[PDB]
């Protein structure tokens, strides 16, 4: 299966606009996080499926725990949410050498404000001005009128919990 295009891509998508690649009809990192929900990872190699979906994005180190069923936080509630009955695997590895600039890497953003939480596998790419007060904003950012997206601004000297991490989520359909 063409997994090389997903893992070895030059640039990953922002978590708010996470990318999904459908893979069907087909057949390693130094230190990484690899776990599966609903099935053992030794048994995934012996299980036939019709389609496998690969979701890829970039988040902080300390946010990787949110990529799991039944979690909360800015990523799980406003960016990428998994259903409680999630059956798949989660892969995440350190990408500090690729997605960190001394002056700040502004390729990756996350949704910091939203009126409600995301449903599972819901994507929201809108950029409407978020109204935090009682007065309308009319599309003008200002006091109590926030732009809903925020940059990570990855720097190479940040701590391990603040370094950028590339995440791949594998869902299975059969």
């Amino acid at each position, epitope marked *: 299966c063409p997994f090389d295009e997903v893992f070895d891509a030059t640039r990953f998508a922002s978590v708010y606009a996470w990318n999904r690649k459908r893979i069907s009809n087909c057949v390693l990192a130094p230190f990484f996080t690899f776990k599966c929900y609903g099935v*053992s990872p030794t048994k995934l190699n012996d299980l036939s499926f019709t389609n496998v979906y690969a979701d890829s994005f970039v988040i902080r180190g300390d946010e990787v725990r949110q990529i799991a069923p039944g979690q909360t936080g800015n990523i799980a509630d406003y960016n990428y949410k998994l259903p409680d009955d999630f059956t798949g695997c*989660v892969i995440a590895w350190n990408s500090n050498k690729l997605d960190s600039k001394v002056s700040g890497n502004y390729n990756y953003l996350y949704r910091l404000f939203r009126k409600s939480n995301l449903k599972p596998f819901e994507r929201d790419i809108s950029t409407e001005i978020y109204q935090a007060g009682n007065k309308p904003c009319n599309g003008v950012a200002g006091f109590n009128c926030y732009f809903p997206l925020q940059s990570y601004g990855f720097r190479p000297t940040y701590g391990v919990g603040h370094q950028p991490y590339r995440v791949v989520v594998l869902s299975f359909e059969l």
Partner: nanobody
Framework: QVQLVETGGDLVQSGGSLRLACVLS????????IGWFRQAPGKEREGISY????????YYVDSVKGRFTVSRDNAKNTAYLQMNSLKPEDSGIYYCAADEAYYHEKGWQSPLGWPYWGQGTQVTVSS
């Protein structure tokens, strides 16, 4: 919800033993994978041992292989970590973690993937 409490740490001499306990509360021990971590001063929280749920395999790092052992007590809903022939290099704060996920053999040593954590217990081994 899920709650972890690690106890058992104490001041012990070199070559001694110590048994650490991690009591799960709110959920069933058999439905969660347990991982033990330690944090040396100035260093990050590093994994030591892994106990997969549903009678899954157990994995240990090379530094504690043969000297550390993990067990489970479903009656007491408690996971244990038996530490024998300790060395001063084993000192630090020891945490347990819980996760309903089946981990890979080389993908559990990182603490970033575990959602549920305890609060730690100090283990001091004098030279």
């Amino acid at each position: 919800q899920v709650q972890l409490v690690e106890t058992g740490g104490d001041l012990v001499q070199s070559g001694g033993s110590l048994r650490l306990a991690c009591v799960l509360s709110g959920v069933t021990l058999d439905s969660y994978s347990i991982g033990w971590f330690r944090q040396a001063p100035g260093k990050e929280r590093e994994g030591i041992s892994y106990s997969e749920k549903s009678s899954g395999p157990t994995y240990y790092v090379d530094s504690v292989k043969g000297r550390f052992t993990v067990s489970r007590d479903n009656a007491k809903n408690t996971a244990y970590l038996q530490m024998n022939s300790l060395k001063p290099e084993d000192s630090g704060i020891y945490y347990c973690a819980a996760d309903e996920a089946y981990y890979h053999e080389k993908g559990w040593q990182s603490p970033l993937g575990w959602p549920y954590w305890g609060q730690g217990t100090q283990v001091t081994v004098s030279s």
